[PDB]
Structure formats: structure tokens, C-alpha cells
Amino acid sequence: KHNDAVSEMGEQIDQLNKLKTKAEHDRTHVQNDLNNTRHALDQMCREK
Amino acid sequence: KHNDAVSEMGEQIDQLNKLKTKAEHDRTHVQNDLNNTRHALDQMCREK
Numbered sequence: 001k002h003n004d005a006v007s008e009m010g011e012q013i014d015q016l017n018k019l020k021t022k023a024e025h026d027r028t029h030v031q032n033d034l035n036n037t038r039h040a041l042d043q044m045c046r047e048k
Numbered sequence: 049k050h051n052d053a054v055s056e057m058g059e060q061i062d063q064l065n066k067l068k069t070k071a072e073h074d075r076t077h078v079q080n081d082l083n084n085t086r087h088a089l090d091q092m093c094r095e096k
Contacts, residue, residue: 005054016064023068027071030079044092045092
């Protein structure tokens with residue numbers, strides 16, 4: 001019953017680790033374009 | 049010794065979960081700067 005409890009919590013925490021990194025990627029994905037579009041902004045304002 | 053293992057990974061269940069609630073809370077907060085910035089480029093792009 002220990003080795004069940006390690007595993008059923010273990011089958012919980014491993015897919016939860018997928019839910020973090022999936023949410024972690026969507027954080028860095030939206031920040032990267034903000035890192036791009038701000039760099040797109042000040043380059044365009046340099047031209048004006 | 050079986051029971052404290054539950055508490056330590058349950059703390060890992062918690063701290064990974066509050067990290068997700070932290071990270072998803074950026075995903076709107078970072079997005080507020082995006083609609084701030086993407087509005088600003090479209091103002092300047094017509095102005096150029």
C-alpha cells in the first residue's frame with residue numbers, strides 16, 4: 001500500500017509536470033514576441 | 049517514514065501547483081503589455 005501510494009501519486013506528479021511546462025512554454029511564447037515586437041517598435045520609431 | 053514521504057511530495061504537489069497559478073497569472077499580466085505595445089505600433093505605423 002506504500003508502493004501503490006508512491007505510484008498513484010507518481011502517476012499524478014509526472015503529468016502535472018507536463019501541465020507546468022506547457023503553461024511555462026505559453027508564458028515564454030508570449031513574452032518572446034513581446035521581446036520581438038518591442039524590438040520591432042523602437043526600430044520602427046528610429047525610422048520616423 | 050512512509051508518512052513523511054507523503055508530506056514532502058505533497059509539498060511538491062503544492063509548490064508546483066502554486067507555481068502554475070503564479071505562471072498563468074503572468075500570462076494575462078504580460079498580455080496587458082502586448083495589447084499596450086501592439087496598439088502603439090499601429091499608431092506609429094500610420095504616422096510614418
